[PDB]
Structures are given as structure tokens and as C-alpha cells.
């Protein structure tokens, strides 16, 4: 692909969670062929965010995955025109988010137009109370559902006090160019981490590492 081994990443997120509006900008870099990326996030309006920053972090690009040569890489093949995705984040206590990203490429830079809507989080729950610690490493199941590439994930947020908080992801991924060839069923291992942040999460440094595999026995 004409995707560079070192790409710059620019991002704008506009969102509303439990009626709280915010805008967040991201500036980062990554290595598409190693499945590695890092971003610095700055809240531009609405801060300090009155909910757990962790619900946002997977909305801050499946180009950043190390694909084996024998698995069709839909994401890298979607450039230069790019692709979009839409995701439902359904939490075990009835909280619900819907997020969208339109991803483009202008030379050495990926651009990200992100929308994030969340609602129905209980007032007393770990999201509004900011009791989350991290997402656990996960495995995304990539498959074709009605001719649409779909990733399902059983995610969990570690919380304060030795508790977990479950969230089901379903993401649809659609190339801008038609006739981009759908891949076979496969998996993507993800690890996402807040490397650093300021006390009120006005600034956050984020990292993800992702690697694709066929399943068992292929690793
Ligand atoms: Cl802030
Ligand atoms: Na709160």
C-alpha cells in the first residue's frame, strides 16, 4: 500500500455523553505495518469531562494492525480513498454509546472526523462516577454479516475495587471505494493504554497495539 511506514494522525471528535457536550482534538503518529500508534488528546471544550475518559478511547483506525501476508487487509486496501466505521458500545448497566469515524489520508497524514454519542449511563455508575481504570486486552472477531465487514468484541473495563464492567462492541467497516474486496473471517488482538494524563484528563497520551491472526492453529 501507499500508506507510509510512519504516518501522522490528526483527529477531531465532537461528542455528547449524558447531555454533556465536548470537543476533543488529537495529534499523533503510528506505524501501520507494526500495528502501533500513539496520540496526544486535548479537550477543547466541555472540560473537565464529567465521565470516564476510557469510554472514548477506542474512538481515538484498523489500518493500525499488523496483518499477516495471508489475511486480506481491508483497511490498508481502502486507501487512498479511505473508509468509515460505525460502532455501538453497549454497556452491561444499560449505558449506550454510538460512535462514527470517517477516515481519510492526505499524503503522510490520516485524518479522522469522529462523532461520539452516549446516553442512559446511570448517575451512580462507574462511567459518570469516573471509577474506570483501563480496558482489558481484547480480541475482535472480524466477519462478514450481510455483505458488511463487522467486528464484534466482548470488552471489559477494569474498575476500582477489583471489579469489571462489561461492554459489547459491534463495529461496521465500509470502504469509500466500491469493489474493495472483503476479507475472510479473522481476529484482531488489541491492547489500548492511557500512557499518561493530567489530573482532570484535559490532556491524555494514548497508545494501541494490534495484531491480526487467523485463529487456532496459526499462532
Ligand atoms: Cl478538560
Ligand atoms: Na460525573
From TrEMBL:
This protein's record includes keyword Phosphoprotein: no
Chain positions with Phenylalanine amide modification: 60
Cysteine sulfenic acid (-SOH): residues bearing it: 167
InterPro entries in the record: GFP (IPR009017), GFP-related (IPR011584), Green_fluorescent_prot (IPR000786)
Annotated signal sequence range: none
Presence of the UniProt keyword Iron in the record: no
Transmembrane feature ranges: none
Listed GO biological process terms: bioluminescence; generation of precursor metabolites and energy
Superkingdom per UniProt: Eukaryota
Keyword entries, A-Z: Chromophore, Luminescence, Photoprotein
Similarity comment text for this entry: Belongs to the GFP family.
Name of the protein described by the UniProt record: Green to red photoconvertible GFP-like protein EosFP
Species of origin: Lobophyllia hemprichii (Lobed brain coral)
Amino acid at each position: 500500500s501507499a500508506i507510509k511506514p510512519d504516518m501522522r494522525i490528526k483527529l477531531r471528535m465532537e461528542g455528547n455523553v449524558n447531555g454533556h457536550h465536548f470537543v476533543i482534538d488529537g495529534d499523533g503518529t503510528g506505524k501501520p505495518y507494526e500495528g502501533k500508534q500513539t496520540m496526544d488528546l486535548e479537550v477543547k471544550e466541555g472540560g473537565p469531562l464529567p465521565f470516564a475518559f476510557d469510554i472514548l478511547t477506542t474512538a481515538f483506525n484498523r489500518v493500525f494492525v499488523k496483518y499477516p501476508d495471508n489475511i486480506q487487509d481491508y483497511f490498508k486496501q481502502s486507501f487512498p480513498k479511505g473508509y468509515s466505521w460505525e460502532r455501538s458500545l453497549t454497556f452491561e448497566d444499560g449505558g449506550i454509546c454510538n460512535a462514527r469515524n470517517d477516515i481519510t489520508m492526505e499524503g503522510d497524514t490520516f485524518y479522522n472526523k469522529v462523532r461520539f454519542y452516549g446516553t442512559n449511563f446511570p448517575a451512580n455508575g462507574p462511567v459518570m462516577q469516573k471509577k474506570t481504570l483501563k480496558w482489558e486486552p481484547s480480541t475482535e472477531k472480524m466477519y462478514v454479516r450481510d455483505g458488511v465487514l463487522t467486528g464484534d468484541i466482548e470488552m471489559a473495563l477494569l474498575l476500582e475495587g477489583n471489579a469489571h464492567y462489561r461492554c459489547d462492541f459491534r463495529t461496521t467497516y465500509k470502504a469509500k471505494e466500491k469493489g474493495v474486496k472483503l476479507p475472510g473471517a479473522h481476529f484482531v488482538d488489541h491492547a489500548i493504554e492511557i500512557l499518561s494524563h493530567d489530573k482532570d484528563y484535559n490532556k491524555v497520551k494514548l497508545y494501541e497495539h494490534a495484531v491480526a491472526h487467523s485463529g487456532l492453529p496459526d499462532n
